[PDB]
Design a binder for this molecule. Structure first.
Ligand SMILES: NS(=O)(=O)c1ccc(Nc2nc(Cl)nc(NCCO)n2)cc1
Ligand SMILES: [Zn+2]
Length: 257
């Protein structure tokens, strides 16, 4: 099965998922000087006030904080998007060291981690149908750098002990994802893909320019998770990121000058 090791990592994925070498793969390097300001891009609308978190799951690749997406309770609209996209889950990708971990890079700079808030286009009815569409998903990407703690992340950090291994889940209600956002919603946007198998080309990427700061202690707790299941040899869940893929025939647009 695919993963992030030497023998099943990103350079191997194309064998089971040929779209890995496709025309709109993610992540990518964001070359800030080549991105073009698009004055027609609208401000992002992040409406998370009625978000209902339910559960947190270690899926063997990352951990997902899952939301009730059976109504318009937490939605992303505006920006480059047409219509309404519902929040279904967020997760992170992170490194074994603070100098790596993000999937997108900015002028080749790697951040310590990257948060993905995953949303699906309500015109397609559910996530499974949405991922089959070129405009099916909108993923809001937020970089993490190590410095001051992010207070709104701490409730996530403190439950990780209870989902150490693959397949473990825990109740995770009343978590407010607004506490994970930076001050500014300035963003870059481009058409891309899921960054893990099945690597489907269904995502409008919206990557915020402003990173959030998390503490060394907070990211160290991410690195104590396991890729393996309980009772299997311990393999730390670190470096669960795909590297930058070729931009090919795409332009990255900026919402800001
Ligand atoms: N890293 S990412 O591109 O944001 C991303 C987002 C979602 C998924 N996949 C996903 N996301 C959800 Cl909410 N459900 C399922 N069901 C399939 C489970 O195998 N798969 C993969 C990568
Ligand atoms: Zn992701």
């Amino acid at each position: 099965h695919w993963g992030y090791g030497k023998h099943n990592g990103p350079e191997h994925w194309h064998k089971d998922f040929p779209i890995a070498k496709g025309e709109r793969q993610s992540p990518v390097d964001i070359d800030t000087h080549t991105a073009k300001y698009d004055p027609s891009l609208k401000p992002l609308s992040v409406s998370y006030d009625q978000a209902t978190s339910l559960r947190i799951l270690n899926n063997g690749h990352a951990f997902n904080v899952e939301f009730d997406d059976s109504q318009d309770k937490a939605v992303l609209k505006g920006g480059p998007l047409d219509g309404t996209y519902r929040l279904i889950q967020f997760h992170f990708h992170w490194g074994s060291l603070d100098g790596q971990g993000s999937e997108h890079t900015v002028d080749k700079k790697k951040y310590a981690a990257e948060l993905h808030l995953v949303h699906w286009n309500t015109k397609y009815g559910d996530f499974g149908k949405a991922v089959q569409q070129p405009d099916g998903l909108a993923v809001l990407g937020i970089f993490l750098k190590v410095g001051s703690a992010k207070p709104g992340l701490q409730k996530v950090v403190d439950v990780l002990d209870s989902i150490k291994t693959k397949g473990k889940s825990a109740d995770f209600t009343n978590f407010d994802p607004r506490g994970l956002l930076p001050e500014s919603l300035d963003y870059w946007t481009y058409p891309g893909s899921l960054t893990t198998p099945p690597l489907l080309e269904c995502v409008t990427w919206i990557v915020l320019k402003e990173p959030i700061s998390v503490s060394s202690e907070q990211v160290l707790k991410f690195r104590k998770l396991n890729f393996n299941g309980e009772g299997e040899p311990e393999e730390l869940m670190v470096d669960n990121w795909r590297p930058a893929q070729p931009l090919k025939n795409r332009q990255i647009k900026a919402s800001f000058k």
